[PDB]
Amino acid sequence: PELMWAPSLRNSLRVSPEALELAEREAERARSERWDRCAQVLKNRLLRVELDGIMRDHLARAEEIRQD
Amino acid sequence: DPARLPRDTGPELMWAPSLRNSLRVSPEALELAEREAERARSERWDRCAQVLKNRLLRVELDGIMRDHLARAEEIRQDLDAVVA
Amino acid sequence: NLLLAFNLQNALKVLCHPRLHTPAHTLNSLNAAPAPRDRRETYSLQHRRPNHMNVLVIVDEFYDNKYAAPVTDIALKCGLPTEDFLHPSNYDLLRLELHPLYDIYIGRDAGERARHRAVHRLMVGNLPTPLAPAAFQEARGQQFETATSLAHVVDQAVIETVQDTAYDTAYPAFFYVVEAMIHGFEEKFVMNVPLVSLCINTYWERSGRLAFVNSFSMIKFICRHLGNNAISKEAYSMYRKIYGELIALEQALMRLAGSDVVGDESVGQYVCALLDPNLLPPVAYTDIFTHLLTVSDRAPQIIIGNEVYADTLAAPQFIERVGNMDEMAAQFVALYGYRVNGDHDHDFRLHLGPYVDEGHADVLEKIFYYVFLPTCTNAHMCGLGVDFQHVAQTLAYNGPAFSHHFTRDEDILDNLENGTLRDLLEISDLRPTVGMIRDLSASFMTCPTFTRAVRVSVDNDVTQQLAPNPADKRTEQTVLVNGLVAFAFSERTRAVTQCLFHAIPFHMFYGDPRVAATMHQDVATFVMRNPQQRAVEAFNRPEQLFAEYREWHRSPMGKYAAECLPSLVSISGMTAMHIKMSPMAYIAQAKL
Amino acid sequence: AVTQCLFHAIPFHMFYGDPRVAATMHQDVATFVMRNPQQRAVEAFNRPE
Amino acid sequence: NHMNVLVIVDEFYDNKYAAPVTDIALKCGLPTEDFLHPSNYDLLRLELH
Amino acid sequence: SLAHVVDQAVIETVQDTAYDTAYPAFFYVVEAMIHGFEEKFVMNVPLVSLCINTYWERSGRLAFVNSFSMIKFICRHLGNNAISKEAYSMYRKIYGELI
Amino acid sequence: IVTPVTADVAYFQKSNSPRGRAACVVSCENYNQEVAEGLIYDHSRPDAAY
Amino acid sequence: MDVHIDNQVLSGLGTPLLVHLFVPDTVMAELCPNRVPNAWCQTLFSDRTGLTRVCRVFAARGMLPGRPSHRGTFTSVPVYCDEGLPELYNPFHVAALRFYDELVGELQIYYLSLFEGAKRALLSRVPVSFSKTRRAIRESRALVRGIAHIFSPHALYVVTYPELSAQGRLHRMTAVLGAPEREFRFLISVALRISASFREKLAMQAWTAQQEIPVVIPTSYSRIYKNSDLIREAFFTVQTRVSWESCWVKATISNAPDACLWIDSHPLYEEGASAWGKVIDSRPPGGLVGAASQLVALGTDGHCVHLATTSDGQAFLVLPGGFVIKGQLALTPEERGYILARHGIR
Amino acid sequence: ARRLPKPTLQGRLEADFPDSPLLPKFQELNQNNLPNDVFREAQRSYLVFLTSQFCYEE
Amino acid sequence: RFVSQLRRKLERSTHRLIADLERLKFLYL
DSSP states (O other), rough: OOOOOOOOOOOOOOOOSSSSHHHHHHHHHHHHHHHHHHHHHHHHHHHHHHHHHOOOOOOOHHHHTOOO | OEEEEEOOOSSSSSSSSOSBOOOOOHHHHHHHHHHHHHHHHHHHTTTTSSHHHHHHHHHHHHHHHHHHHHHHHHHHHTTTOOOO | OOOOOOGGGGGGTTTTTTGGOTTHHHHHHHHSOSSOOOOOOOOSSSSOOOSSOOHHHHHHSSTOOOOHHHHHOHHTTTTOHHHHSSSSSGGHTTOOOOOTTEEEOOOOOOOOOOOEEEOOOOGGGGTTTTSSSSHHHHHHHHHHHHHHOOOOOSSSSSHHHHHHHOOOOOOHHHHHHHHHHHOOHHHHHHHHHHHHHHHHHHHHHHSSOOOOOHHHHHHHHHSSSOOSSSSSSHHHHHHHHHHHHHHHHHHHHHHHHTTEETTTTSSSSHBBSSSOTTOOEEESSSSOOOHHHOSSSSSOESSSSSSSOOOSHHHEEEEEEEETTTTTGHHHHHHHHHTTOOOOTOOOOEEEEEOOOOOOTHHHHHHHHIIIIHHTTTOEEEEEOOOOOHHHHHSSSHHHHSOOSSSSSOSTTSOOOOSHHHHHHHHTTOOTTTTTTHHHHHHTTOOOOOOOOOOEEEOOTTTTTOOSSSSGGGGEEEEEOOOOEEEEOOOHHHHSSSTTTTEEOOOOOOOOHHHHHHSSHHHHHHHHHHHGSTTTTTTOOOOTTOOOOSSOOOOOHHHHHHHSSSHHHHHHHHHTTTTTTHHHHHHHTTTT | OOOGGGOOOOSSSSSOOOOHHHHHTTHHHHHHHHHHHGGTTTTTTTOOO | OOOOOHHHHHHHHOOOOOOOHHHHHHTOOOOOHTTSSSGGGHHHHTOOO | OOOOOHHHHHHHHHHHHHOOTTOTTHHHHHHHHHHHTTTTGGGGGGHHHHHHHHHHSHHHHHHHHOOOHHHHHHHHOHHHHHOOHHHHHHHHHHHHHHO | OOOOOOOOOOTTTOOOOSSSOOHHHHHHHHTTTHHHHHTTTTTTOOOOOO | OOOHHHHHHTTTOOEEEEEEEOOOOSTTTTSSSGGGOOOEEOOSSSSOEEEEEEEOOHHHHOOOOOOOOOEEEEEEEEEESSOOSSOOOSSSSSEEEEEOOOOOEEEEEEEEHHHHHHHHHOOOOOOOGGGGGGGGOOOTTTEEEEEOOOOSSSSEEEEEEOOSHHHTTTTOOOOOOTHHHHHHHHHHHHHHHHHHHHHHHHHSSSSSOOOOOOBETTTTTTHHSOOOHHHHTTTTHHHHHOOOSSHHHHHHHOOOOOOOOEEEESSSSSOOOEEEEEOOOOSSSSSSHHHHHHHHHHOOOTTTEEEEEEESSSSEEEEEOOOOEEEEEEOOOHHHHHHHHHHHHO | OOOOOOOOOOSSTTTTSOOOOTTTOOOOSSSSOOOHHHEEEHHHHHHHHHHHHHHHOH | OTTTTTTHHHHHHHHHHHHHHHHHHHHOO
């Protein structure tokens, strides 16, 4: 049939001494990519809301045009 | 040193095999999720590459958008010296 | 011993309470159960949002060498009759079906407690075929037809000839490229009027039946224009009758809505879902997108590749109109530069035309794409997608149209080279002269570049916004922008148009594998390995493209559409099953 | 679009005050039927006072 | 107060939002089963000859 | 809920096709040459349209319904006015009935 | 008395008042005109039998 | 229009200036589902990180805007940050709100997204509430405007109207980066030191499972999980994009309230944003046998990797398959005080 | 990620028609900043864009 | 007095062209 390992506290994981050092470096190279994408799209939204400030200030400066 | 066994059900003492002490693993769905997430990771590998060229070209377009008002400002400020 | 009557309307003193409609007690019962249902689904629960924009990569990634082919529980319901549904073999299905307006699913145990999440059945066509079979639906439609005292002015002959239109494998793909070039613009059709005057004439001569019924705006232009004796009278008569059935059926639905208003707005958008403007027609050439942001008191979200577009104050940021072609003469080369030097992946811009403020409530297109063409032709068409640069290189790098000194009124077959237009015109066998192909070349100044798909995300109306999961109150829907929909292909068509068209099975009525496997040789092997997927009810469709649970039209609608015999009773049943299941819908139903 | 310089729809009767034919003629009733879509019926459609 | 017929119809449809229905069209579009019900008492209160 | 697109006259005509004692043997030699794949078929298109169309007129019955591959071709490669409309309609009905 | 042409014949096969509303007046309380006039004339409430 | 005159007269102690807001009902659906909350203001800085005092904000839900364009709840943002003269603004500057009815969900908001929208908009006696007198006469549509929200790409509606010299000095205010940067890199620093603790604990031990939690496991576990398949333990650090919902800091704030546990759950390889910071009880008479049942049900979750944090300064990682890797928690108390001040009171 | 494959479009139409008035409006693109094939299909697309311009203008 | 019309419609047109160029930026990104 199908056999299952019995629950005991001497059961071993498949031993991993070497697969964790490259692991967190790949993790850091991925998360810097994600954080740079998030900050890029964040600054995209920030320039979008910052540009409407100068559009409002242009329409505020245009008052002096309206009597000239 | 482990041991091997088919089945049992419903214990009270903890370290006894059961049907609730089995981790519920579906191999094909996990392989499918693992493969599609490897491809999402492989797309995430190639994302922050060439927005620097977009930064230089956006510096170019804000330059050419400032130069137009730089052209307009002194021309608009020379058409006020004919009034005398 | 008096004969006390019991109608429906006496039962609306208890069929209009909200406690029929709030599933919060039901989900608090199903989540507090000591045992959940063991078999899980995880196929099309949530429309995950695509980061890219082109729809060819989504289709070609969803179907390369795919082995595990799941099926949803909704297609598991409507694939069997009443009796075996109530048999105790299917307790794993009857653990979920427990409310007539809510098909509760279990989802996944990704977190800690796999919660029974419940999406809402909007229309009465979402009832599973076991609990409401096809005969009940069409007999209900027969009650509906004498309820509104409808005058069904189409015979049987128009229905069967438009049925074997779609069931013709030898449909000329030149009609597809003509539609892809015109794509629903009035001033564009005023160019190509004597073209289609030749096309549908030689098709009516070819095989008796008619063509170009695979687009609403095309046959709308056929009825509006072109009655000037260019086609034979019997060919124009089918188009005019098809245009007449829709306006008669809409007058029937507006009779069913009655003369009542809520607040100040009328009640037609609450009882029937066709008069609901928040339902969108599945082909969007024109602007409609700003319109339903302006007319809907509910708050919709036009999701174009994880871009929300929640307000029309930042409206020109997401979408630009092309307007009339004579405005853009200062922007022709600028549009060509945006064509070539614009990275269209990670480009969230939509190229459309104007919103024509027509007297048909963006609803004549809705009724024709949702009641007629899926039922006269048994939902046996798939949405294809075109690349306009490729059809432009098809239609203008040829010999005689480029020279402009080869004259107009001559044959085009003798003097063109053996390009894709050559073998595209062989199997079609029509003879459009030079010059009337020139405006087909000339439209490319103002056509867009791609067939983008937008998954619109409208919220439900006020009657059924009672789900406890606030992101599950809304009902998503997809719509293939700027592409027509296409009937059956041959392999000869695919051998000459594998560089031209790509299929997108995006809708319930319009995702059909028996047609999409012909023109796309990735699903042709996907159905070769899993042959049970060939029914329209159970076919796999991309969850990043089309969410099967979160949809206005579930699987039983397609099951009824694929098994109804095409006739008048089936049409009346199909417009009878588009009625929503609101309490107001119950009131306007028991009035009639 | 041709005869909007030639004609004007006058809904004036019960038999001859059909709204769904006036929308092919008069543009203003064609936008009026959009705000009150129940009045495309010949019974209830508001006619000039 | 005049002769012309275009200005009467055009004055009637400019921005016609509040376009209510009269009673005799409201009594008109109901079948018999709802009309005798006490839902439409406001119609049965004024229909008595 | 299968829908027979084929009516009685199509089955009648193919029955009279099979029962016709004078079936022209040139059809069998064309079937011998045009075997299987389609590249050999597309180099004989007006040939088979000729020998089909003159059999739609010498009699009222059709032909080339003996091999499935010719039906699979003719529904998918012909119908572009190489043949008669009324002869093509029968083959299209047969191939639609099969699917 | 005049009647509409859509009255139920099953109403006429049984004994009732010649109007439509039954006069369930003894059920209405003694010396109380408001509930009586509400049962016999005011049509917010339906017929006492139907 | 009640919560604005509520908090306007209230926060006069710790705030000079008060800004009023709307919050739509779509923008916080991913924050807390099923409408479970119904606040607390703590605006941290961009480069002047430190710690600041807290201010309470009152609010209401279920009451509808005068705009029918969207229909949502009521909030308001206090501003008290600028030293001395308030004429300067801090640009690129977060302002945290803790919207709650019983502390679930956070609200991060900018000073640019607030103020750019604000500019874009514009036999004795009882004394009257003075500031409510001018809101009833306004009643206009131009007071509310649509602001593209930066944290979540949606609309956030502000309300302001020409009240008085406090809101009159607001619309003239301008001035001449790193407010969203510091918290994320601080999370990655404590995550890297915890993963380094796990690395050195697996190094000083034999690189072996002690299997603290008992599960039965099949013999093909070295097949359906591949050899040394710690790719989930690999990309664990990118997946923790949240922290104050995550259980890791939840044990540190739980020091102020002995045998307690908090559990994070991350899926086996990207099944979705599973959960963060659930509770394992030992106080009520459900007892340690109920804790053991919830713990073994945690351990038998074959497609979710769990991370366990204790109150006493210990960290644990739970492999799916019952394998446990021990670890330390010992962090410098500066970050501890920074965290408990970031949530609440020391 | 990818697009449709390219149609046939055999030969050259610039090297066949010397009587095209659009021939001066063609050679305003550069060769050395890109490889041969993308430049070839770019001349294809620019030619058919000019043909569309001439067709709409006539 | 013709100096208050042509230069004024000039600066109005340039004040619209700068909004057109900001819209061209929003076309770009």
